[PDB]
Write a protein that holds these residues in place. Structure first.
Motif, short mmCIF file in Angstrom:
data_model
loop_
_atom_site.label_atom_id
_atom_site.label_comp_id
_atom_site.label_asym_id
_atom_site.label_seq_id
_atom_site.Cartn_x
_atom_site.Cartn_y
_atom_site.Cartn_z
N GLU A 105 19.21 -100.54 -38.54
CA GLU A 105 18.08 -99.62 -38.62
C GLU A 105 17.77 -99.37 -40.10
OE1 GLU A 105 14.85 -97.46 -37.55
OE2 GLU A 105 16.14 -98.68 -36.27
N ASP A 106 18.81 -99.20 -40.91
CA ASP A 106 18.63 -98.98 -42.34
C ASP A 106 17.93 -100.20 -42.95
OD1 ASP A 106 20.06 -96.58 -42.21
OD2 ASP A 106 21.94 -97.53 -42.82
N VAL A 107 18.38 -101.38 -42.56
CA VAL A 107 17.81 -102.62 -43.08
C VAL A 107 16.32 -102.69 -42.73
CG1 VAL A 107 17.82 -105.14 -42.84
CG2 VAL A 107 19.97 -103.89 -43.08
N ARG A 108 15.99 -102.38 -41.49
CA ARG A 108 14.61 -102.41 -41.05
C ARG A 108 13.73 -101.44 -41.85
NH1 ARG A 108 11.71 -104.00 -36.85
NH2 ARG A 108 9.79 -102.86 -36.34
N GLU A 109 14.18 -100.20 -41.97
CA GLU A 109 13.40 -99.20 -42.69
C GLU A 109 13.31 -99.48 -44.19
OE1 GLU A 109 13.94 -95.10 -41.47
OE2 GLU A 109 14.64 -95.72 -39.48
N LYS A 110 14.35 -100.08 -44.76
CA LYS A 110 14.32 -100.41 -46.18
C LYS A 110 13.35 -101.56 -46.41
CE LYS A 110 18.78 -98.67 -47.60
NZ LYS A 110 19.96 -98.88 -48.48
N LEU A 111 13.30 -102.51 -45.47
CA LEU A 111 12.39 -103.63 -45.63
C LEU A 111 10.95 -103.13 -45.54
CD1 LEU A 111 10.50 -105.82 -44.07
CD2 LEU A 111 11.83 -106.56 -46.05
N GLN A 112 10.67 -102.25 -44.58
CA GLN A 112 9.32 -101.72 -44.43
C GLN A 112 8.85 -100.99 -45.68
OE1 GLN A 112 8.50 -98.20 -41.89
NE2 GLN A 112 6.93 -99.48 -40.92
N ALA A 113 9.71 -100.13 -46.21
CA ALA A 113 9.39 -99.37 -47.42
C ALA A 113 9.13 -100.31 -48.59
CB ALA A 113 10.53 -98.42 -47.75
N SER A 114 9.94 -101.36 -48.67
CA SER A 114 9.81 -102.34 -49.75
C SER A 114 8.47 -103.07 -49.67
CB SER A 114 10.96 -103.35 -49.68
OG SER A 114 12.21 -102.72 -49.90
N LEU A 115 8.18 -103.62 -48.50
CA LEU A 115 6.94 -104.35 -48.30
C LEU A 115 5.72 -103.46 -48.55
CD1 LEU A 115 8.48 -106.79 -47.59
CD2 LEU A 115 7.61 -106.68 -45.25
N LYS A 116 5.81 -102.20 -48.12
CA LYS A 116 4.73 -101.24 -48.31
C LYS A 116 4.45 -101.00 -49.80
CE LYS A 116 4.29 -97.43 -45.81
NZ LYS A 116 5.06 -98.46 -45.07
#
Lengths: 246, 246
Positions: A105-116
């Motif tokens: 879940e952390d990986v998913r949310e970190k990737l989203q924040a990064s891409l954003k």
């Protein structure tokens, strides 16, 4: 695909060792338009490293926050990274999943924040020894990749990293053939979940044990597009690992 | 005891916002030999912040590793901090215990690593809302402090911070009187676990909500020796909070 070779300096370095190492790296003549070479220094070493490294070298940080700006003592937000023009971030390295309870879940949310925030992400995953001997390597990898793969919009901006945990720091070694089999399965997951074009475009790096003697045998594999190099990237000889991908 | 006023910028700031804020801070004329004023920027903002702030201001980082140099992706070791001449580190901030499973043992190991590398430590602790309602404030505080207190060698190099979590983002408020009562007990704990001379010299900061409106009432308490300031340290008016301790 454009090959990608990255140096994960992990938690190592002094102002002086970085000066000597970066000087050695700068001596290597390579075309950044033909190959991506990224150096990931410790956060407090980023400025020093970015300045010492020639522009042909790309840079990034070893971790990023899933929370944005705010009351998160000790975290570095993707917004902050973007303001500093930090190009890449590593997400999900097995050491953070191991020592710091980092979850999918952390990986998913970190990737989203990064891409954003227009950051490019080097996302790591891999099965444990127990999971491998239990014949659930692909089952595990599929779940880990599917935790975030649907977030990828530009397949040049997210780079996958396979980390064969059973062969990292254990004395055990994964063969280039074993690596290739996993890499081909990872590409198939991207193909089935996203698309064939996307799958053939995305870089999948080998993140297991990489040195000057085996880098050529690995980069030669059809589905291995580069490496996320650990301790070997702290040596001047890292330039020879980069050369194997030129 | 030499008062200590610290600014915990948490995960906030842009290169430009820092420039503007530091300019405002540099306008304050204070004697660093009579009062300690420390600014804790985000790791990647440290170089920028340190060069912008006049020498009168001390600086540090918001977290440090419990591990030394090595294969710990994303961590900053005490050794690396020492090499960069980073003077202070914050350890155990409730936000890391809240979001990153930081434990009492983690705090202990981090303090040990810091002290071993000649770093000065600002160690935080405090009870939750439920624990306070259960009337277990002192019990909780005593256990948190005893988790690391024996590691203190030089009592000028370790600064304690009491964070009343029950009054942090809970609508509730912690009064100066309530704070003074806790600080007095914390100092007694240090007196009874270490020594009377050691307890009299160690600084114990209030880490609850601190603003220009309540800072004077807090610093006035006999056992409160300064503060670890959150959001109020992101505004120019932070200078008035420093002034309250001058």
């Amino acid at each position: 695909r454009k090959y990608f070779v990255a140096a994960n300096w992990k938690c190592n370095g002094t102002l002086e060792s970085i000066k000597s190492l970066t000087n050695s790296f700068n001596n290597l003549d390579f075309d950044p338009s033909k190959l991506d070479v990224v150096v990931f220094p410790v956060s407090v070493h980023y400025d020093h490293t970015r300045k010492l490294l020639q522009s042909k070298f790309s840079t990034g940080i070893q971790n990023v926050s899933k929370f944005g700006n705010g009351s998160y003592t000790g975290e570095v937000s993707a917004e902050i990274a973007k303001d500093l023009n930090i190009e890449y971030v590593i997400i999900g390295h097995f050491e953070r999943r191991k020592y710091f309870h980092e979850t999918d879940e952390d990986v998913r949310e970190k990737l989203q924040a990064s891409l954003k925030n227009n950051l490019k992400a080097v996302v790591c995953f891999g099965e444990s020894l127990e999971q491998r001997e239990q014949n659930k390597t692909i089952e595990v990898i599929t779940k880990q990749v599917k935790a975030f793969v649907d977030l990828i919009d530009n397949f040049d901006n997210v780079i996958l990293v396979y980390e064969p945990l059973f062969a990292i720091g254990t004395g055990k070694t994964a063969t280039p053939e074993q690596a290739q089999l996993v890499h081909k399965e990872i590409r198939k997951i991207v193909k089935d979940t996203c698309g064939e074009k996307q799958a053939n475009q995305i870089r999948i790096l080998y993140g297991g044990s990489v040195n000057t003697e085996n880098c050529s045998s690995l980069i030669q594999q059809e589905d291995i597009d580069g490496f996320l190099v650990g301790n070997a990237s702290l040596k001047e000889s890292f330039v020879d690992i980069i050369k194997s991908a030129m």
